Amino acid sequence: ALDFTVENVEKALHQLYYDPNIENKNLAQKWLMQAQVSPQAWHFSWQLLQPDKVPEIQYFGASALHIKISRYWSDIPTDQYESLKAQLFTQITRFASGSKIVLTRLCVALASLALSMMPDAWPCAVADMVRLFQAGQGRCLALLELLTVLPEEFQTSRLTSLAVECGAVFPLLEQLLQQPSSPSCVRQKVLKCFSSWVQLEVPLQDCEALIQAAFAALQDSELFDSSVEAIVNAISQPDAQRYVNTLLKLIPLVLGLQEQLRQAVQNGDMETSHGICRIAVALGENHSRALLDQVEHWQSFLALVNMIMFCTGIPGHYPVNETTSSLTLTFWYTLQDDILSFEAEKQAVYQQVYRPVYFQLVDVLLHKAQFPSDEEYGFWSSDEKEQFRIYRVDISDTLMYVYEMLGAELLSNLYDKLGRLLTSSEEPYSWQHTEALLYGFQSIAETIDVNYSDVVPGLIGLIPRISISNVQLADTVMFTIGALSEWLADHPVMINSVLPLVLHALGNPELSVSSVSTLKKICRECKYDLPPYAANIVAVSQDVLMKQIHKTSQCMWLMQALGFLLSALQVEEILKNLHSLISPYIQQLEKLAEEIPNPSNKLAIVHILGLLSNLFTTLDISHHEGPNPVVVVLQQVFQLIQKVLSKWLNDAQVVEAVCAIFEKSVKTLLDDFAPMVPQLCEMLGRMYSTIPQASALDLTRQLVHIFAHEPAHFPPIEALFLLVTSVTLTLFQQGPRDHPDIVDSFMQLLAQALKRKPDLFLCERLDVKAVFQCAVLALKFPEAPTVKASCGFFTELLPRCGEVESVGKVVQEDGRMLLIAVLEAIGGQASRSLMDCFADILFALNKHCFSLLSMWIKEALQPPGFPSARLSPEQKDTFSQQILRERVNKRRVKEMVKEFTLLCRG
Amino acid sequence: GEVPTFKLVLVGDGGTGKTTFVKRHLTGEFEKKYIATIGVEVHPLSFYTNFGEIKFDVWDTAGLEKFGGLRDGYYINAQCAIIMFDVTSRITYKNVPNWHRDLVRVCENIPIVLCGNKVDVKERKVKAKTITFHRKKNLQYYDISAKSNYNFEKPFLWLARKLAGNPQLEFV
Ligand SMILES: Nc1nc2c(ncn2[C@@H]2O[C@H](COP(=O)(O)OP(=O)(O)OP(=O)(O)O)[C@@H](O)[C@H]2O)c(=O)[nH]1
């Protein structure tokens, strides 16, 4: 029998924090949650905040107070407000000497209190906090903590702008910061307070003086980080562009950091170079165009560009020596977007001014992306190499966008350097410089307009002339080739100059990913000009597969590459080649088919199955993007598959593999699967009747999508559709929330039925009431994806009322339930993330069954505080009115639903 | 108990995957259901490394406000953390700053890994290029998929390395 006394809380906390027993930690935390909510918490928490106890113990006391105040306000009698206010102040004054962690939590507490009575009961909170805390250092640091945390809690509280009260905070900050006698600690806290208050709707114009102090503070090591933060938050404000005049005052201030930046780079001072870069990039990436329009200031914007160019080209490598360069990329891109954004009279002037800058940037970027010497790279940490890889991806993306603006000359310049480096000048061999240039080409190779290509042919010719003595170089060569995948399709004559190189690299285990992904790309892009290479490719592939050279993922890309290849060969050649390739695996499967139930077999079984599905994903003779080979293969394989199912029935992973085979084969041949319909339905129907799984519903949905209007083959699918719906409905009664995944596929299936073939709902063998009922309950599920699927169903249902579907409008005898479920979600029962899905249901109610909706909604909102208790009848009526307009568009219904849900929650 | 145990606090919005992640590491199976957590549930998690054994006491906190429990209070004595968000939900990401703000209030400078979960879902709504979190030395980001098992171990490896000040650590 343990009551909530200090003694027992302490024991509890000690347990939670120090007893290594897990079961015990969990037990203590549960009890501590109870103690926190108990009204004893109002007595024992002040006892925990005694100098008598350890800091983590005291902490809980303040933690409890903040939670009771911010989350159980209604349980606080008004006669307690002032005395609570006073006690928090007292303890805050006392903890100025003690733990800063507790001091913070205490401040957060007094800040919640403040925000809760600030408009009505406590008229001038901010002004009173200042007056009270004055009349020494501790008191000051305290008030600053309180004033910093206050605006932070304002951004996350639920239930009149605080910004307006900032006019009282600022004067004090200016005063404290511009005075000589203040300590560094007070100053750092003054710069942090400023960052918190700037993060609100405080006009830039009114921050100017603190912006200037922050800048002066940068030269002090102690205040640097705080200033940098305070300054970036000022400039990065959403409203900041509105005050252009102040933006003009900011340019000289940022430029004034040039010397500090240089010195910092000379000294290898990372944190500082990084700080100034962030400042400079904040000004540019946000207010670039406002600065470009103010043509009278073009000289300064130019200096700012130079400064950011300086940070991009810092000596060394990104991850290991220079964090600063990476932060300059988002800027280079916005400048490009801006330059291309105006009429030629302005565009050409700036394109003239900034073209040479982007050529420099390309030179700089190519040098920074260049790998280090083999020895150097060998000592780079695993995380460092990873960071470098991502950094290349980022540079690649920016390099691509630069090509948009430079275009033609870029490709010529690159082609020259590469060719000059390979055939004209014998210099110290650096595969690194060769790889950088090729990498530049690779990043742009997909975005080459089909107009100019004088460079492509030349480059394609230089590729076989390159030395492949390094994995990286071999990988880059391979990637460049695949990037020219589309370009080759148009120039089949060039295929011969690259295909051999790619095929060669297929055997090298270390180039698997690049090699295989390029083969696949080439096969996909030039299906029609590969027939004369098909056998050789099949030969190399089979050999490489025979030897464990590629991992299963790459093996799937191979099967895909091959499918693309065979799809353009004459029927008899497709057969002959297919047999030589799959016969062994089918036989192997047969030997694996007459074996035990061990995993080693499982792995093998799954592999062969995935090989088949991947090949059939890619092989289409009808080019949708004499019988069908795939169909025959399926027919002759079916007996084997069934044998597999019989012995592996209970295994979900193996079953999925079989499902994937057909899932993949169906999307490949859309009408030409007709012969496989009857057999597949029995299989899918038997599967689901034994063990219900979501892929079975998905497969069914695909058949429905295809053969709906094909009466000749649809009958068996109709049976399946009904059978699967009968089982999912029985299942749903029993486990209303046990299979969100199945409910999800179920809803999508039903939505496909309504989309493609509504008359399916007029079958009396299908329980239309049940379905509608399941649908509405689904709307309340925890799993967002299941709820999205549900909204999907109603969006294909409501358009079918009075659309030759009697059963459709019949279920609008239950229509007001749907409206209720939708209003409960918008009220705050569903995640804000799903709001656009419920708005879609509303839109569908207003446009297709408006008469009903209006009676429905007038009634549903009648009960006081229905969606949310936070609502007012006036707000309820306004919403009811807006949503009853007959011409509203999804765009508007979404905007009002969002506005409304916001009022319901806070 | 030849090796220490680090306190790892797992934080983030409701339904992001916190519990499913942890659970997959502990049993291997992926839970399809979303059963909100109430307060916290501390689960021990151990990994064998090429230098020895690393033990973690994952403090799986609750993302839903209504079930927050002792949110600030679970952070005490943390040696590190993991902030999680849904890559298919813009709201779980816009909230990352608030979760981070509170961890810092209790523990400062502890290593933190930010994970974007559910990247296996075809329609992503938060592109990995947007992440600016890892711009700090004790901060890192990762695209993870508790469902597809993608970058499953990355966060724990990074943290482990930072904690034992040894970039050479590798899980065995
Ligand atoms: N598609 C996809 N879904 C996932 C992934 N990880 C988790 N989920 C889904 O999210 C659900 C689990 O949500 P939880 O982890 O229990 O949510 P939670 O973090 O415990 O929410 P809180 O208790 O408030 O912290 C599961 O049903 C999964 O299907 C993923 O990587 N991909």
Ligand SMILES: [Mg+2]
């Ligand atoms: Mg959880």
